[PDB]
Amino acid sequence: XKAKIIRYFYNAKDGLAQTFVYGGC
Amino acid sequence: XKARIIRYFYNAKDGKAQTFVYGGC
Numbered sequence: 782x783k784a785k786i787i788r789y790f791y792n793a794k795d796g797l798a799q800t801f802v803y804g805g806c
Numbered sequence: 807x808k809a810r811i812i813r814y815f816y817n818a819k820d821g822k823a824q825t826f827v828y829g830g831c
């Protein structure tokens with residue numbers, strides 16, 4: 782692995798989810 | 807550096823995902 786770490790705060794509501802990810806495996 | 811962040815924005819059909827690209831390093 783995944784050439785992209787993960788950093789979000791979820792947010793379903795119609796299927797939403799602020800996904801602010803940062804580079805990095 | 808603290809740049810290069812794949813700032814994503816999982817957005818439901820209500821809109822259309824999103825990503826603010828502006829990494830400098």
Ligand SMILES: *C(=O)CNC(=O)/C=N/OCC(=O)NCC(*)=O
Pocket residue numbers: 785787800802814816817822823824
């Ligand atoms: C319209 O095209 C809706 N698009 C999406 O919902 C797509 N976003 O997916 C972003 C994703 O999978 N990011 C993975 C890394 O965190």
